[PDB]
Amino acid sequence: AAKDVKFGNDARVKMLRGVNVLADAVKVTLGPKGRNVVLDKSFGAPTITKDGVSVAREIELEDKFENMGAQMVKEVASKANDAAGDGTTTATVLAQAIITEGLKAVAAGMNPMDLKRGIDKAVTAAVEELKALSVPCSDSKAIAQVGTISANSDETVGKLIAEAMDKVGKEGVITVEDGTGLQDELDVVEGMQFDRGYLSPYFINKPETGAVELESPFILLADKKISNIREMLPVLEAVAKAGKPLLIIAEDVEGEALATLVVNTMRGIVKVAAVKAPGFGDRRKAMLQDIATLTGGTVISEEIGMELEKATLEDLGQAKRVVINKDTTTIIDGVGEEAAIQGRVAQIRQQIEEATSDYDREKLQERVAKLAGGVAVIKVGAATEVEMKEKKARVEDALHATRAAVEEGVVAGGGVALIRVASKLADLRGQNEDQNVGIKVALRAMEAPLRQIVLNCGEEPSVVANTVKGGDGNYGYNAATEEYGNMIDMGILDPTKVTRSALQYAASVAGLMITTECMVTDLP
Amino acid sequence: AAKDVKFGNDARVKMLRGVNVLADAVKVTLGPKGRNVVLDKSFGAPTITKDGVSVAREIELEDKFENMGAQMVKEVASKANDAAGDGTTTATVLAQAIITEGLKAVAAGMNPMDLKRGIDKAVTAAVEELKALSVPCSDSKAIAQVGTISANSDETVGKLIAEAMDKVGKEGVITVEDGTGLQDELDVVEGMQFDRGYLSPYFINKPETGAVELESPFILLADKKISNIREMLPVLEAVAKAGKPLLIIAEDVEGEALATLVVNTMRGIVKVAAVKAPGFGDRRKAMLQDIATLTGGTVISEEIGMELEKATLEDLGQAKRVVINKDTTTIIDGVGEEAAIQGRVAQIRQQIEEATSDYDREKLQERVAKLAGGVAVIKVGAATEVEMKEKKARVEDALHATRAAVEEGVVAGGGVALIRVASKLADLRGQNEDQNVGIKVALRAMEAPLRQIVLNCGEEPSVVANTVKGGDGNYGYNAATEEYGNMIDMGILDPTKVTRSALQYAASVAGLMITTECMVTDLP
Amino acid sequence: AAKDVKFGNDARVKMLRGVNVLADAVKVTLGPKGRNVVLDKSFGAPTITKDGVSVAREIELEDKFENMGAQMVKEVASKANDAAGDGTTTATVLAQAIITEGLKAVAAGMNPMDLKRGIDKAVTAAVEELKALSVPCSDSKAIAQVGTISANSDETVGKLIAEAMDKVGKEGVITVEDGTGLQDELDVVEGMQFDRGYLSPYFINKPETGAVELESPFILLADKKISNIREMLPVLEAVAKAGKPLLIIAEDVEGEALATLVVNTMRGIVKVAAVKAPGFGDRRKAMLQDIATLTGGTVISEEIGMELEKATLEDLGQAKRVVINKDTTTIIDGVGEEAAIQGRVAQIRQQIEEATSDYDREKLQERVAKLAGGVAVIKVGAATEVEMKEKKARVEDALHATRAAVEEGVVAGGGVALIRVASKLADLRGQNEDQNVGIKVALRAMEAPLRQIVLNCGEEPSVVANTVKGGDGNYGYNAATEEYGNMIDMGILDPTKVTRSALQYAASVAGLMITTECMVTDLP
Ligand SMILES: Nc1ncnc2c1ncn2[C@@H]1O[C@H](COP(=O)(O)OP(=O)(O)OP(=O)(O)O)[C@@H](O)[C@H]1O
Ligand SMILES: Nc1ncnc2c1ncn2[C@@H]1O[C@H](COP(=O)(O)OP(=O)(O)OP(=O)(O)O)[C@@H](O)[C@H]1O
Ligand SMILES: Nc1ncnc2c1ncn2[C@@H]1O[C@H](COP(=O)(O)OP(=O)(O)OP(=O)(O)O)[C@@H](O)[C@H]1O
Ligand SMILES: [K+]
Ligand SMILES: [K+]
Ligand SMILES: [K+]
Ligand SMILES: [Mg+2]
Ligand SMILES: [Mg+2]
Ligand SMILES: [Mg+2]
């Protein structure tokens, strides 16, 4: 089809318009006094959000040029959320400021490519200064403060998140979800707990709970479908002679074998709980070997060279307690070597490092968390459901900030460390005065976050930012409190990863955003 | 698609317009003198209702922003009906009042999120004051009065409701349904009566009713398909020797054994009634175990490890009387261990507490009702159908309010206890003057329900509400009578649960409603 | 979708407009001088009708709100036809008058629900007065008069209807159909006559009519398929030895068996007429048992414990005469126990009592009428097809009125007994002046039927109704004769059921029609 092309300043005007629209929509939610953006939903009820990339990803314009400029500027918030999951509004504001200043420099009749070169130089130096200005955040206090700041000044959320990684450990998994009531809560799970309920309620030794519990159980790890008691005659006779409970973690147990086993349960012969092997296929064998490592047993497999009729007490993994309910089979203290546990989680972490999909690395990380540490779950509560969504989003922003602050540390919060960094780079010069103008573009843009945070509080971002710049280090502006002081002190803490990724993506977008000369869309 | 985005006071104006439209439609039905609304039906004749959430759920606007604002405000009535099933119009009125006052506060150029914090603080205190002001409603008189008030001043409805729980007991089930004549009706059923008619009319011992009746029956509980009489030669010989009637509650009886048994019936060998096991699968096993508990029998199964040919008189459950008609089989006074019934319904109640779906907990509650107490049914009568719908809806609203009043007690009805509670909180102050103004928003909005109830009666809500506030406690306005006095005494009873849930949901919506800054919807 | 909402007096005006349109279309057919309405048929020629509910059910309005009110007011005529099948125009007129007067009362600013309460009170009293004013219509004279008035002053129709129940008896069934020529026809059928012609023409003992007739027939009631003579060797040998004609009422007789039987018919061995068992399944067994009761025979079925090869003369039911033609098999005077006939029809009437569908009770009443009484048919003859339609509908209205008058009696015709009833209620007062005004609304609306009937006759409904009210009892206005005088004596009779149901449904609709405040409908 015939295309629609804008050359020269017109293309830049469309770009600035789209970028400004998207950034104006995003930035109203920045800072502790940022407000919420109500998003209509064609299906169901509208949502209420204060997240930056959430607002950014919903922005499209009817003007094709402005729309696709907004499409290119949405990448800043999208990638900032992708990296750190927080500070997306700061990324959008910084990108818009860099783009505007660089376009103004282009409007002076000078090379945009050297503007991009200088912008990249200055922002690289600024990211370095942010990383060097990083102060570690590994104490649950500062972690809770970081989560607070990214939960829109919510101390309870950051506190609960710090308690969550405290309960689960560093190698454990922390999850934020909804609770049923109006209040949030945290639960941590240690050892193995896999959602494989008993394959028959007749195994239930505690009908008041509808659950099976086995003590010092024999965990027959069968990477096979358990069918005929003739397969289990040697092993189940050996277990009845042993008398201790046997736990079935296999592909399944058939109806006739299940009938024999259940009958024997109230015949008193064998106290067996039949459940399935967690995972499916490769992950099924992964869980099977995981349980074997925890319980010191062997996975009954056929291609390796043994049979179920060859299985005896030794092939049976051994645990201390295995609680089976209608859904979960919790191997509590699998009686087996820890050494195979660390070796398994080591191969698992090697897989994580070789896992490109976040899904793969996360599944393997959860394999570690079950096998090595624990699993913690945060439930969040609210009376209504828009409150549910907003509070859960804030709690997960807090989670992202807490983890990133554990990762890289923190800096002076509220866009103040960026002001310090910009003060640290007022001297940088590129290859030509054009690259120097690009550096000045970046430097002028670096003070936008605090100014926008303060503007969301309704002060003078000019006067307030000036007073903040008057002090240095962590001296800033407590935007929620409307005061100046050490941003680290009162707990205005932002992860260095958050700000660094935001700045990097903002500059990387703005560098090519400035150098646009020919812009083509389709005809409307 | 290109979106339609709004900022500033325009967003709040659109929110307020949609919310006001929805609440104005809702509140014409509040109070004893509330009027009805005809809802047109594209299919069939239009309907007439005085319910609040029913009117609320039908409201949508052509204006996208106002329409979706109505979408978020409809949540108040929807959730109030979900929790309490009554007082939904009061919830809508309270939500609209809080929203309007908080938006007015925002219009003063002041912080909305602190308004939300103060509103939540004041409303939590108000819910506490309401619950502390709860007076118990467990006697049939106060139940009748609650049903009266929530059936639009209909004493017959609340009376029938109190009589219903009196007949069925508290663990029993009460249902409001349609009657054929011009009048309401109440029926209670004891024991199990399960809709499993005789599998053959030749079993009918009373053809004048076309029904089978067995006395001291042998209840063969066989969770298996009867396939040949050869399966029943042990039990049928044992019963012909016993001579007492045998009742079959099995999976089914095949046609050949059915023919043999029917022949034996007029051959006089065994007095047979063949019916099926109520439920299907797991619920079928549940019903079979229930019948076994009451009748002192055992469900014939093969996984447990025994055959029907192995069954004898003992495996046949025993009752006092079992009446089988073309549809139902009523095990009247199953002669068997009650203790197993209470243990069974205890496991059933454990399931109820572990039943998240209302369907699951309700099925298990009915299992309790049949096994422990009884089952009650309320009918309703009318000449035409719009009358039928309006009356039955009033009866069910009254049922919901009576049960909520049994649960949490009652308070001063007609928007009066809310006035007392608001008077109890005139002092509360939040974190800042912003939260204080939010608390005052909540306090000012708390008194709206009396105003709307009085206005639906056509008085001066100002002067009448002032006179109501002049007295306290249960002194208020008898809106139907258009007089002042004790709300509790004059039969003006509203459940504390109803008002508490209404207030909670109204405030929880209004809190984020106030903090709205931007709207994003599709372009029209 | 975006809704169209009407509040207050706009909604009331739209309701009244729809009601008025529907009632104006209906009432032109009221009285002996009601005028006919051509209803266009998109397929075929339009019809000409003087029926009230027939005109009412065709009313559709483009205005959603007027159409809404019209749909709610159509219920009056629909339910009046549903209950009594007659006097539907009177129901529509009464409902319109009550609605108009109640809307006028509400337009005075007074409480609508109390108006509904008073209207219901007054109409309940009026229905009681109508029932107390009922004078029996059981003799053929008053039946003919009721039919005449409800056949729009057609004595032939009511006469034929009285003759119809005279020929068929009260337990019998009267049916009105159209005839072939220009004259109506009445036919009565007694005993058994089921449309099961001979299975083969070689059974025909009278080729001049193509019919089979058996004298003292042996009725083989086989609830089974009859296949091979080897099944019938005992039966047919027993018949040939008995020499009596053998009538087979079974599922069928197979082609080889039929060929052998037909051969034997002109071989002189057995005079067999093979016909099928009337009904299908349960109703087939019901017909078989009815014939067994009438003919003193036994139904051959396997599940009781006998076989066709076990059948002999005793299992062969016995009749006096069975006339079989190409279609029907008429067991005329089945010689057998009448006691089982009355017991069976008593069970069938029991089934009527727990028959929910009108089809169920109709089937069962026809079973009784065949087995106990008779069956009657009324034809409708005329030169053309529109005359078919009009005459048949008129005759069936007359039939409905005659039966309802046999049921509850009659009252003064032409809306005069209603005038007397309203004169008997001029004092009723409700709980408040609002209920009193509702009662007065009902009383004022009560005189509408006579006034509209007279207006259809072209007199002064004012002066005429005033003169009617001046006299009392049966003194009224002979609308057809344009004269005053006794309604009962000169043959103006209407069922008390018709008027009572009409008034009840009119008030039941109008009660909620008055109290509505608001409308909800889709946008046009
Ligand atoms: N009490 C406070 N005083 C000063 N600055 C604060 C305060 N609380 C938060 N901030 C700053 O404001 C921002 C927090 O706002 P918000 O959490 O809504 O957005 P974000 O962290 O930039 O992005 P995201 O939408 O991805 O979570 C951060 O830049 C933080 O440093
Ligand atoms: N006779 C009365 N005197 C005073 N207040 C009354 C009287 N009857 C009802 N009320 C009050 O008016 C309201 C009853 O109105 P209505 O029953 O139509 O709606 P609701 O209870 O708010 O909600 P729902 O539509 O869910 O049933 C309640 O707030 C009740 O306390
Ligand atoms: N000769 C008459 N004198 C007085 N009133 C009469 C006379 N004939 C009929 N009526 C009255 O007119 C009505 C009968 O007319 P018509 O059969 O057309 O209407 P309907 O009975 O209301 O309607 P439908 O049979 O369609 O339900 C009755 O109210 C009857 O009392
Ligand atoms: K944000
Ligand atoms: K209401
Ligand atoms: K008519
Ligand atoms: Mg944040
Ligand atoms: Mg109510
Ligand atoms: Mg008639």
UniProtKB/Swiss-Prot annotation, chains A, B, C:
Q: Read off the Pfam families from this record.
A: Cpn60_TCP1 (PF00118)
Task: Report the catalytic activity.
Answer: ATP + H2O + a folded polypeptide = ADP + phosphate + an unfolded polypeptide
GO CC annotations, alphabetized:
cytosol; GroEL-GroES complex; membrane
The record, for InterPro entries, names: Chaperonin_Cpn60_CS, Cpn60/GroEL, Cpn60/GroEL/TCP-1, GroEL-like_apical_dom_sf, GROEL-like_equatorial_sf, TCP-1-like_intermed_sf
Task: Please tell me, according to the UniProt entry, what happens when changing A108C.
Answer: Forms inter-ring disulfide bonds. Prevents ring separation and leads to the formation of high amounts of symmetric GroEL:GroES2 complexes
In UniProt terms, what is the effect of altering E75S? Complex stability is significantly decreased.tuberculosis
**Quick one: which residues bind ATP?**
29-32, 50, 86-90, 414, 478-480, 494
Q: Report the GO molecular function annotations.
A: ATP binding; ATP hydrolysis activity; ATP-dependent protein folding chaperone; identical protein binding; isomerase activity; magnesium ion binding; unfolded protein binding
Q: What class of enzyme is it?
A: isomerase
Q: How is it modified after translation?
A: Phosphorylated reversibly during heat shock.
Give the CDD domains listed for this entry: GroEL
Q: Which UniProt keywords apply?
A: Acetylation, ATP-binding, Chaperone, Cytoplasm, Isomerase, Nucleotide-binding
Task: Quote the subcellular location field of this record.
Answer: Cytoplasm
Q: Which residues carry this modification: N6-acetyllysine?
A: K116
Give residue numbers for the modification (N6-succinyllysine). Answer: K33, K50, K116, K276, K320, K389
Activity regulation (record text) = During the substrate-folding cycle, the two GroEL rings separate for effective substrate binding and chaperonin activity. Ring separation is triggered by ATP binding to the trans ring of the asymmetric GroEL:GroES complex and avoids formation of functionally impaired symmetric GroEL:GroES2 complexes. Activity of the GroEL-GroES chaperonin complex requires Mg-ATP. UMPylation of the chaperone by SelO/YdiU negatively regulates its activity, and may facilitate survival under stress conditions.
Entry function: Together with its co-chaperonin GroES, plays an essential role in assisting protein folding. The GroEL-GroES system forms a nano-cage that allows encapsulation of the non-native substrate proteins and provides a physical environment optimized to promote and accelerate protein folding, probably by preventing aggregation and by entropically destabilizing folding intermediates. Also plays a role in coupling between replication of the F plasmid and cell division of the cell.
Q: Tell me the protein family, please.
A: Belongs to the chaperonin (HSP60) family.
Instruction: State whether it acts alone or in a complex, and with which partners, per the record.
Output: Forms a cylinder of 14 subunits composed of two heptameric rings stacked back-to-back. Interacts with the co-chaperonin GroES. Can form asymmetrical complexes, composed of one GroEL and one GroES, and symmetrical complexes, formed between one GroEL and two GroES oligomers. The asymmetrical complex is the functional unit. It was suggested that the symmetric heterooligomer may represent a transient intermediate in the chaperonin protein folding cycle.
Q: What is known of its domains?
A: Each subunit is composed of an apical domain that binds non-folded proteins and GroES, an intermediate domain and an equatorial domain that binds ATP and is involved in inter-ring interactions. Forms a large central channel that appears to traverse the entire length of the cylinder with no obstruction. The central channel of GroEL functions as two cavities, one in each ring, that are separated from each other by the crystallographically disordered 23-amino-acid C-terminal segments of the seven subunits. The entry and exit of polypeptide seem to be restricted to the apical end of each ring.
| Name of this protein | Chaperonin GroEL
* Gene name tied to this protein: groEL
